[PDB]
């Protein structure tokens, strides 16, 4: 529950799930995605409803849009730990900031899907659960494991609590832009 390999394999779980959700919305059973697909018990597929609903409000945000539109690199790996060192920088963790760093570790992932380098979604996929255990995994752990992240984005104004998320990310890749 609070394991070191339960927050590590709902990590994965939770990134795998948001990236297959997307990945059958464009093309159903045909994206090649190289990781096999866990079945997710009913607390994790709590987390991934959670995680979709905030995704697809991510997804109607413009300036964070235009922000992750503008990420073309042959080297996703290298955009994406910039972001990551840099929201975490400030040592202020909270649930909003893990759900940005799924977010973008997803749309890295789903550009490589509809670019047709499967192999992309393995290095992305590593990088960011190795990321989880080096930067995250302590405080995950002092929150009780995942399941605060339900109580963090259940409110009738989740929108509001994501405009923080986008507009941390946007931050993040801001900086990058100018890196």
Request: proline share 4%.
């Given at each position: ?45 709590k987390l991934s ?92 752990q002092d929150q ?15 929108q509001t609590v ?18």
């Amino acid at each position: 529950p609070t394991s070191s390999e339960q927050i590590m394999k709902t990590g994965a779980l939770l990134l795998q799930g948001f990236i297959q959700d997307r990945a059958g919305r464009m093309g159903g059973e045909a994206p090649e995605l190289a990781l096999d697909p866990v079945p997710q018990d009913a607390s994790t597929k709590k987390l991934s409803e959670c995680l979709k609903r905030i995704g697809d409000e991510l997804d109607s945000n413009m300036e964070l849009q235009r922000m992750i539109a503008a990420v073309d690199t042959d080297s996703p790996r290298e955009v994406f730990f910039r972001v990551a060192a840099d929201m975490f920088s400030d040592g202020n963790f909270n649930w909003g900031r893990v759900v940005a760093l799924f977010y973008f570790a997803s749309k890295l992932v789903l550009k490589a899907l509809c670019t047709k380098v499967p192999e992309l979604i393995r290095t992305i996929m590593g990088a960011t659960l190795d990321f989880l255990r080096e930067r995250l995994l302590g405080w995950i752990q002092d929150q009780g494991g995942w399941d605060g992240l339900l109580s963090y984005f259940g409110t009738p104004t989740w929108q509001t609590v994501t405009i923080f998320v986008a507009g941390v990310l946007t931050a993040s890749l801001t900086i990058w832009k100018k890196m």
